[PDB]
Design a protein around this ligand. Sequence first.
Ligand SMILES: NC(=O)C1=CN([C@@H]2O[C@H](COP(=O)(O)OP(=O)(O)OC[C@H]3O[C@@H](n4cnc5c(N)ncnc54)[C@H](O)[C@@H]3O)[C@@H](O)[C@H]2O)C=CC1
Ligand SMILES: Cc1cc2nc3c(=O)[nH]c(=O)nc-3n(C[C@H](O)[C@H](O)[C@H](O)COP(=O)(O)O)c2cc1C
Ligand code: SF4
Ligand code: SF4
Ligand code: SF4
Ligand code: SF4
Ligand code: FES
Ligand code: FES
Ligand SMILES: [Mg+2]
Lengths: 230, 217, 43, 59, 433
Amino acid sequence: SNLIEVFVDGQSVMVEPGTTVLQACEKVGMQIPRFCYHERLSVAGNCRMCLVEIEKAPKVVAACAMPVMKGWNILTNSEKSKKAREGVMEFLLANHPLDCPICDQGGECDLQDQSMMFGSDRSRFLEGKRAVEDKNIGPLVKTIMTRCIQCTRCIRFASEIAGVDDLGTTGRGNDMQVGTYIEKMFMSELSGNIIDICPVGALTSKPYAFTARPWETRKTESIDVMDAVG
Amino acid sequence: GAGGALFVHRDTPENNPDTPFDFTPENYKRIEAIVKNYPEGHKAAAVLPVLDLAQRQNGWLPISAMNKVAEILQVPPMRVYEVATFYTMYNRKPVGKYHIQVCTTTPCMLRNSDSILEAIQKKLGIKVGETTPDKLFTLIEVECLGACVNAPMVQINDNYYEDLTPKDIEEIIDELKAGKIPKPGPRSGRFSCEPAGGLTSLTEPPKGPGFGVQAGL
Amino acid sequence: FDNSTYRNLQHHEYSTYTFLDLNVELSKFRMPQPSSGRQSPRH
Amino acid sequence: RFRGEHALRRYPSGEERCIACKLCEAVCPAQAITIEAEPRADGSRRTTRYDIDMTKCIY
Amino acid sequence: APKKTSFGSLKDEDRIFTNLYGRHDWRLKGAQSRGDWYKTKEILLKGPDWILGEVKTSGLRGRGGAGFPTGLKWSFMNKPSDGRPKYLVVNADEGEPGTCKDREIIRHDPHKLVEGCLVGGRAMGARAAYIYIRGEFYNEASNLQVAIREAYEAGLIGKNACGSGYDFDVFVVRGAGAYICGEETALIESIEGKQGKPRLKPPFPADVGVFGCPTTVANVETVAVSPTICRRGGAWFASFGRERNSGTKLFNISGHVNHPCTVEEEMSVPLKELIEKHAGGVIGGWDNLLAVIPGGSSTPLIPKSVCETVLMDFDALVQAQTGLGTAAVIVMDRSTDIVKAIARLIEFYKHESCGQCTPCREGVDWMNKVMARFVKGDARPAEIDSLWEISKQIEGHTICALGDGAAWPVQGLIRHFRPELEERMQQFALQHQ
Ligand SMILES: NC(=O)C1=CN([C@@H]2O[C@H](COP(=O)(O)OP(=O)(O)OC[C@H]3O[C@@H](n4cnc5c(N)ncnc54)[C@H](O)[C@@H]3O)[C@@H](O)[C@H]2O)C=CC1
Ligand SMILES: Cc1cc2nc3c(=O)[nH]c(=O)nc-3n(C[C@H](O)[C@H](O)[C@H](O)COP(=O)(O)O)c2cc1C
Ligand code: SF4
Ligand code: SF4
Ligand code: SF4
Ligand code: SF4
Ligand code: FES
Ligand code: FES
Ligand SMILES: [Mg+2]
């Protein structure tokens, strides 16, 4: 019908108009690295981890936000894509705190795993790190904002899914901080979900703190009975 | 270097949600005119001017002023806080009667803006980013103000004073604290962006309406 | 005719509300604004 | 470098060094280490259980 | 002799901004005396296609600094209406260090800007014009508002602009201290009451712009030269400069010159001729020249050896690896600490970054710290290469071009003054054991 033909590493794919590069990549089983993109949230495009090279194009594009075009050949594993990933990971890790042994995210961290799979294995950052003050948003979500990478997933979830506009960014530049700018509890019937969407240990569960590691746990898939939603 | 100003608000006896603030009726009329400049479905676009108006009435922006602006425009308060912390012209703390801003970027730095900064510091006896005990004068360093041709330059209360020497800024401060209004602009017999001597361009009289209009028009 | 004096002295007499007073004065000269069909994106 | 009987160490202040990261528990080839942890009364990340079975350990 | 090869001397009769120095009345009467608002009704009734064709045949390129062809960019908005209103947004943020031209345009002949707004809106089929003026230019904004008021009472704008039957408004919106708000998408976001954070492209402003409507963001110089181009023809504008570098240009010469100033000159004028003719020459003589930043802080600097024969247009400066930018010439003589100047520029960019995207937000701060250490000499020579790579990791990887504008100056400094950095590190090591 209206399907257009693109190429992922030379493999032809038929996609609907408006499909992004990331979704076209997903169709053939290739997952593009991401930090700010969530498939149930608005497209942000700020983390820049999803940069990929289009054949015969000099500038890499943000796969999460760029619609595909007819005849495009997406090169997911080229030198340009890998160098972009390494540079973005280096910038992400320059100011990140050395907190993994005391961070509850350790073992199920997207930052850790994508650094292992797409980043470099060492550092050349020879400066001091930034440190930001912590915020209190209630007894449910523990907050350690030095680990924040400014993906704005929590803000987008709060505005779009929960309907609460209490979260935002204050300042600018390297000093931009995610928070409420005042002492205010982010209290919602769906607030705890921002623990799951947060890719790092910036937001964690307070009742769960320090009790377990992800590789220890045994998972049982079952149903909730606290209401009739199931 | 470091900003030095926090982006977290902590309630204080002189800065809390119950601090009194309200627009005057004249300022309410001005707000109405401001809001009438945007499409009917987009009233948040008036956040930047109205907030500015509040500061022009108060001198600075307490959290009460931000809450009032958010209530007036039906915008959530966090958006107003975001705008107030993003833009550097907003004062989230009281400042002196005259806010002195010295451009220190490379074009002005090349023409010895350090002498102007040192002269201001010596005359007022205060560090950059500090407000005098009297409170009339507040001093800060700003980035390029768009007058690099006339350097070194200073901005005081949205007035531009250009081609400054230490004596010039000393006299400006003296007549500012004496209750007089100094003449804004350059202080080298120049009064614009022309060359200091000669007027190398635009000496012949300008020509009329139909000088070089094409045919068939 | 002469290129002697400077013709931009009027801005010496500008106060804190001049811009918004001019906006108020121009308020009556505009055309009716277009509408998106809502009161706000949250309506 | 000799490897002998196990011990848990402190900082010079007397505070325990262990912060219950469970890296030793994860890496132990004999599964000889058992760790349980919780926030302390002062909010610190410390263990409530640190067991080593020396008849399982391979040193 | 067709196809002129030496440029840089145009007389006053061929200058567009005849009141650049504010020696004549900036009000409506003076503007009409100098040819403003003349036969605008006929130009409006010539139709948008005629105006777009005149702008295209004129060879005018974007005076904001990117040099995009103006006719094609304006014709991107020549689509049929779909229900949404159409807008023209005039960029008057003027954040680039060294640049002062738009301030003089706004304060000394705002009627040129207003008439250009009307003509551009007619060409694009725009309902109204929004002028985003820098928040620090309070008196300039007030002058612009007074000129707009005079135009409104004269019938030149508003209901039935002139006698063309075209309705058009002009609004002035002031910023609040943000350099990033000069970027077109960040400017649109700031107009809508949000933080000045650029949005990704596509979509381009012609599809989804201010209030989600089709809009065009144009520099004030580009808008202000358009009515003159329409009146005198595109051929007259294209007669000046080299091919694909047509027209006249405003230049702001600042730094270590005897007479820093702002002038109007033909495009392809050589840099040395401009400096020694309009700026009084370099302080201490031409042999005292160390380096020149030709197009504002975002352009790479060039040493004295390149400035001997380089011309001031887009193509020649691109071949010199420096770009034309805003045509803001900053001159540094041999008494200048070049490392300190570049570090100050990097500090400016660190203070102006909006923080949205990772490469700018982290890497610009990183390079600021590295250059601060370079100024003293603490670093080791290997770090220089590291710094280069860091800049390469920022350029081309960010949402907007601020990251490029921060990466390029350090690239130029390393390209042309590496021995200075190396000897500074040597002296620091030798002084501190
Ligand atoms: N005037 C000033 O104060 C300042 C100027 N600048 C200059 O800005 C330049 C870079 O700015 P950018 O906007 O990022 O350059 P750009 O090339 O990305 O865009 C320039 C214009 O061309 C349009 N355009 C480009 N490609 C298009 C396409 N495929 N379709 C539709 N429209 C298209 C864009 O809409 C935009 O308005 C720099 O060279 C710098 O010199 C930078 C800072 C301050
Ligand atoms: C960080 C940044 C700041 C900018 N600031 C301005 C500015 O202050 N004024 C301006 O005219 N253009 C500025 N620009 C360039 C704009 O993109 C330009 O104005 C816009 O493309 C208008 O195009 P034009 O030059 O064809 O008119 C800036 C660009 C960037 C990346
Ligand atoms: S968030 Fe991830 S990378 Fe950061 S300290 Fe925690 S586990 Fe380590
Ligand atoms: S707190 Fe977590 S989800 Fe929110 S912006 Fe920071 S890293 Fe992203
Ligand atoms: S849990 Fe094991 S590895 Fe972690 S700090 Fe304690 S003793 Fe060391
Ligand atoms: S490059 Fe810098 S200014 Fe531009 S969007 Fe990214 S962080 Fe913001
Ligand atoms: S995932 Fe695309 S920019 Fe973040
Ligand atoms: S560098 Fe000082 S006004 Fe621009
Ligand atoms: Mg998390």
